[PDB]
Amino acid sequence: VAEVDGDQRILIRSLDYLNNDIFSLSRIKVGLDEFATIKKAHFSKMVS
Numbered sequence: 091v092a093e094v095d096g097d098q099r100i101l102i103r104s105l106d107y108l109n110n111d112i113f114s115l116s117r118i119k120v121g122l123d124e125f126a127t128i129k130k131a132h133f134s135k136m137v138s
Contacts, residue, residue, distance in 0.1 A: 099121065100120045100121060105118065105119065105120050108120075108121075115128070116128040116130075
């Protein structure tokens with residue numbers, strides 16, 4: 091059991107390449123299979 095400072099899993103430059111085939115504003119991928127999604131707001135509030 092050693093201890094070291096956790097490395098960075100995601101790089102900003104990285105996901106610019108990963109997202110060129112994914113055109114969606116709530117669905118972005120920050121890794122191989124994990125996604126990032128903005129919470130849904132249930133449309134009924136679209137009148138405002």
